[PDB]
């Protein structure tokens, strides 16, 4: 699978994170990210995908060692951590053809797992609109505790 790169953008309080909402298969909320092009460096892919999806340029804010990386079904996803972005920043995707909406969410209110269906004696997980974000939430919380306190 082709690696994806993007960002976890936080506000000044460190309470809130910026998620984007796509369409169709990407219909829920997730961190802005996308597939690396041929010969493109990771930091440049992250800036491009984030700029294409939010209209915000992270290039001057990326720190090389500050990211969360996960391997999900043998595809690697790396999100650079970008704190301190004012909550009154105007975000606008390049085209509403890929991005429905862009919103701040409270980190403490986001789920860090989906719910089973043990109530119904049925296997699997209930749908959750944050399914794309969820795998990064606990590692983010842990990373913020270590790097800030």
Ligand X SMILES: Cc1nnc(NC2CCCCCC2)o1
Q: What is the number of other CB atoms lying within 10 angstroms of the CB of residue 27?
A: 13
Q: Considering the rule CB under 6 A, would residue 45 count as an interface residue with ligand X? A: no
How many residues form the binding site for ligand X (CB under 6 A)? 11
Measure the CA–CA gap between 1 and 126, rounded to whole angstroms: 26
Measure the CA–CA gap between 52 and 73, rounded to whole angstroms: 25
Pick from 9, 18, 47, 53: which binds ligand X (CB under 6 A)? Answer: 53
In terms of CB distance, is 26 or 43 closer to ligand X?
26
| Bridge partners, residue 102, by sequence | 20
Pick from 68, 99, 107, 140: which binds ligand X (CB under 6 A)? Answer: 99
Measure the CA–CA gap between 121 and 83, rounded to whole angstroms: 42
1 touches 73 (CB < 8 A): yes
In terms of CB distance, is 73 or 121 closer to ligand X?
73
Q: Considering the rule CB under 6 A, would residue 9 count as an interface residue with ligand X? A: no
Q: Considering the rule CB under 6 A, would residue 42 count as an interface residue with ligand X? A: no
Annotated binding site for Mn(2+): 49, 53
């Amino acid at each position: 699978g082709v690696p994806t790169y993007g960002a976890i953008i936080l506000d000044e309080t460190l309470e809130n994170v910026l998620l984007v909402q796509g369409y169709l298969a990407k219909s829920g909320w997730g961190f802005p990210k996308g597939k690396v092009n041929k010969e493109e460096a990771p930091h440049d892919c992250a800036a491009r995908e984030v700029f294409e999806e939010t209209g915000f340029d992270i290039k001057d804010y990326i720190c090389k060692d500050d990211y969360i990386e996960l391997r999900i079904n043998d595809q690697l996803a790396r999100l650079y951590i970008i704190p301190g972005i004012p909550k009154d920043t105007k975000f606008n995707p390049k085209t509403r053809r890929e991005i429905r909406n862009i919103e701040w969410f409270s980190i403490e209110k986001l789920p860090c797992h989906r719910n089973d269906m043990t109530p119904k004696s049925k296997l699997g997980l209930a749908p959750n609109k944050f399914f794309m974000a969820i795998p990064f939430i606990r590692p983010l919380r842990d990373w913020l505790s270590r790097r800030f306190g």
